[model samples]
Target chain A: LGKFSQTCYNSAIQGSVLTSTCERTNGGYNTSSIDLNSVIENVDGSLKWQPSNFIETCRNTQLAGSSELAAECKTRAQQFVSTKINLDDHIANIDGTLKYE
Target chain B: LGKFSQTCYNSAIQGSVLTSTCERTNGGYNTSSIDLNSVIENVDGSLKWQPSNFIETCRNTQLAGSSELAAECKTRAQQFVSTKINLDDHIANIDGTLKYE
Candidate 1:
């Protein structure tokens, strides 16, 4: 990153980092290339990717693999983590739709 | 540019060259392009083409032909050039308009 701090390489690196970060943030999804493995998880875990990722920006509260509160533990966590939980857990709980898997 | 430009393309017998050029040396805009087909003096000759060409400034602008003088040129050139500009145009004049192509 330091080496690529300026020029097209810098912009490329920024994109690379953002993408990889987003992937790891999403839990093991290789969003950098976006081929077929990348997945997107909103704060609430809704399902979206690719053509959809086009219309959206990085989620505000997605959990990185090492995230402690959500404990996504591994890179592949996004692949397994299921759900679009709202900001307040109580909101889901109160809605009575908090089906656990 | 003798070797540089020649290496790109120089017919063995009938290579073309840029000569006798000018928006009359007065209407010179700030750009250039290989696609002369992308430029043309208006029939009524009103909005003199500004910038030598769609100066590679951003997508819609690089050949940002859709606007200004190029507007009519784009409409006409699309018929001959497949409406496919390589977007090789370096995104210039970025006004925080998060667009790539």
Candidate 2:
């Protein structure tokens, strides 16, 4: 709910170092399970983009018994999904089967 | 030969726009001919990374009959090969099959 969560999702979305490596894989347009997993691991080995990670984060926040933080985690998870959708569209627009041989 | 030649090679080596898209294609570690070709086309529609393009550049420079520029083109072509080797090594180091499930 503070800088930790902010940094976590922000890096997942706009961080260059993470994206740079991911970009090289599958032309940066691939959003397959393996590709997304690699992208997440490139940023944080302990983190994952899958629902299980999101659920764990939410559950952990709730176990701390902080309702606000739990809500924040839920919101952040949705944001991550939205950001990925935006990036997928952007990547699709610029990516194509190479036109030149 | 001059700024034109300098810019041309420089972009091919370190250009972000070109690499970003190419990186996404095969996770940036793939240096296959198709991937390299996509990288070049991303930078310049008419240009290619193959021997033909390099030879054509050399021939064009020779036709201009500027000995200095022709030599510079040869050097640039070699530099391109070296730069690619560096990137291939770098990409290999950081890229891996995803570990997370």
Candidate 3:
């Protein structure tokens, strides 16, 4: 109906005070989501991982409806990204033939 | 006085219906100008030039005050870029040492 949006900041900084908006769907189905796990930027004239690169999403949702839920999920996702596991390795043997070492 | 702003789109499409604003200067002088000559994007899942990359600037100006001036300047500048001469070639050998090839 409205839009889905969120923002993050570097570990040393606070998150965005304002939110962003994008349509829930283009036509009748869900829009292609932007997975921002690897978004980078030239912040202050240096290539840096945008502390705000990490973001959370919710479908059929709004800021007031899921503030706490989004925050918690973002925390967990950040931890996973920070753990630095090889994405290819993690996805291999998908039937659990291999476990993270 | 407020902000310098403009937008362009691929010649195939119309320009932005709305404008954007950034401080004309950071503190007192002109702010760091973003020369977006080579900004590229993954538009529609394909690497493409932003028709909107080319823009114009006017200081001490507003849309209402400088609409004609801005539009004329943008047309000329766009022609320069479309000519596709190397920037280094044009700027260097300046005292007119080497003419454009």
Model 1: per-residue Cα lDDT over B1-100, one tens digit each? 0111211121111111111111222433221111111111111211112122121111121222221111112222232121222211312112211112
For residues B1-101, write the lDDT of model 3, one tens digit per residue: 11122111111101111111222222222211111111222222222222221122111211122101111112323332111111121111112111111
Higher-ranked by lDDT: 1 or 2: 2
Q: Write the per-residue lDDT of candidate 2 for residues A1-101, one digit (tens) a residue.
A: 11121111112221111111122233332211111211111111122122122222222211111101111223422431111111111121112221221
Q: iRMS of each prediction in angstroms?
A: 27.7, 20.8, 23.6
lDDT of each: 0.18, 0.19, 0.18
Worst 10 residues of 3 chain B by lDDT: B10-19
Quote the positional error of residue B23 for candidate 3 in Å: 17
> How far off is residue A90 in model 3, in Å?
29
The order of the candidates by TM-score, greatest first, is 2, 3, 1
Q: What share of the true interface contacts does each candidate keep?
A: 0.00, 0.01, 0.00
What are the runs in model 3 whose C-alpha is more than 4 Å off?
Answer: A1-101, B1-61, B65-71, B74-101
